[PDB]
Amino acid sequence: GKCRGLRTARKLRSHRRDQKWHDKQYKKAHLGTALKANPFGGASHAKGIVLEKVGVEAKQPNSAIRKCVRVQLIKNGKKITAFVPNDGCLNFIEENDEVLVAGFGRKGHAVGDIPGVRFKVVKVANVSLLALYKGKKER
Amino acid sequence: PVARSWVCRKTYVTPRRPFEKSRLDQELKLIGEYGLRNKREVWRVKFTLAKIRKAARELLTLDEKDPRRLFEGNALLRRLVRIGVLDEGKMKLDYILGLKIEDFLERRLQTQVFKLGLAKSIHHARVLIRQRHIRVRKQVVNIPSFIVRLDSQKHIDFSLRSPYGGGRPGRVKRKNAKK
């Protein structure tokens, strides 16, 4: 039961402009609470300071203990658990270091095996964990 | 502020599907036949063909008596005749759509060189067009992916070069050793 007259462009535009809000992607794109609620301020990366080294549980079909770093942010000031990727790198991270972090696959969701950690460590003291992993430079 | 130029065309298209078994085999046999470098200069030919097809469909869209259709149709036909993809025959627009991919690779530099001799195996023709050993009229050519215009098509003859001109470029080493 649509509307199809020649003079109905106002009704069509107003109804579409109202019904565009119920999409989740549009409402978190153009409603302010998604930007001013999360960390990173809507940016790709952020620096922070290591607060502590935290091991957390995994889910039930796959049980393990993941290794993460709690981070005071330089920019915003919110505390973040961030996942540290590879086999080592918990040894490569020490207390109170400048750490660059990013997201995983989509910022609204975590990874499957991990409960509530949304963030991935890229660098420690301006050196990547990739270089720290496959014999490259140093801390 | 500054004003020099700002214009940038990508003669280059990434195809959509990354991993297709048929597409990979088709482009691999195309590479192996016409002796190319990598798939970016394969996709050059695909982008040029797609541009000519979009121009051809935009011309076939309009009415026959239209002056823009007549002018741009005759112009595109003259461009294809000067390249050497078409004959001097079928000047309809639909034959342009009848064209395949391999014609541009067939009308490249080194493939026409290999048909006209003095070349000896496409992968060695790659070296012969890079190292200055194959020419065109009076402007010596370095670049492989050259469009041989049909009205020249013949003048491939190269002066002051080691197999035809003369000089001791590295046989000077061997003959100083034979001294």
Binding site: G55, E57, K67, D87, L90 | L28, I31, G32, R37, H123
Partner: protein, 55 residues
Amino acid sequence: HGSLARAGKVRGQTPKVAKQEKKKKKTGRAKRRMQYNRRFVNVVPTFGKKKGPNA
């Protein structure tokens, strides 16, 4: 909560293997040339049922 002791356990306990010498792989044009010649020009004697690109 759990112990943060074990870290890089497997990569530490992994025995090292000497990275033995490889010949230089041909690059670019020559690589694509042997890619073509390895499977398109002398694999047509073999029959079209089985496939063996690595085993």
